[PDB]
């Protein structure tokens, strides 16, 4: 049995509060590129809002914030999301007890986002190593980045793939 799709291709986003150990400019490029990935191979589209409230709300919040799952300070859990639906559903949290980064040291916001966003999305984990959905953090350039054929797999068995022209 399958987790909850959600249930429209159109999703807006919204980022809530920022963290402090990054440029503010390099955060929304972080989770921009991030929905990106994902944009890439089906046809689900995302915007950013800045007011009003959003499908996925990406939250930078420690220790506990107010739902079911408390952040357990620096290291351990760097981040969770919720699988489609409405609410707290689809949303991304990021723990501020880590040290975001847009490189190799501390803690690389772009590809935790792009994992977060996956299961904002729907997917569960990997077995695969090199599947970004596999559970554990490692580096790798943006650059050189690219989703697995699993992930590939695992997000079009949820909203089929693109779709041209
Ligand atoms: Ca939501
Ligand atoms: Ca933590
Ligand atoms: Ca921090
Ligand atoms: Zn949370
Ligand atoms: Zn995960």
Redesign the pocket.
């Known amino acids: 049995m399958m987790g909850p799709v959600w249930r429209k291709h159109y999703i807006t986003y919204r980022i809530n509060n920022y963290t402090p150990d990054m440029n503010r400019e390099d955060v929304d490029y972080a989770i921009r590129k991030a929905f990106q990935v994902w944009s890439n191979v089906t046809p689900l589209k995302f915007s950013k809002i800045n007011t009003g409230m959003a499908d996925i709300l990406v939250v930078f919040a420690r220790g506990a914030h107010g739902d079911d799952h408390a952040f357990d300070g620096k290291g351990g859990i760097l981040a969770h999301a919720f699988g489609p639906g409405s609410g707290i559903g689809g949303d991304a949290h990021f723990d501020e007890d880590e040290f975001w980064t847009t490189h190799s040291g501390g803690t690389n916001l772009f590809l935790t986002a792009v ?1 977060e966003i996956g ?1 904002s999305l729907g997917l569960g ?1 990997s077995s695969d190593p090199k599947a970004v959905m596999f ?1 554990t953090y490692k580096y790798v350039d943006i650059n050189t980045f690219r989703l697995s054929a699993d992930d590939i797999r695992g997000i079009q068995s949820l909203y089929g793939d693109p779709k041209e022209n």
């Open positions: 994992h299961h984990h559970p």
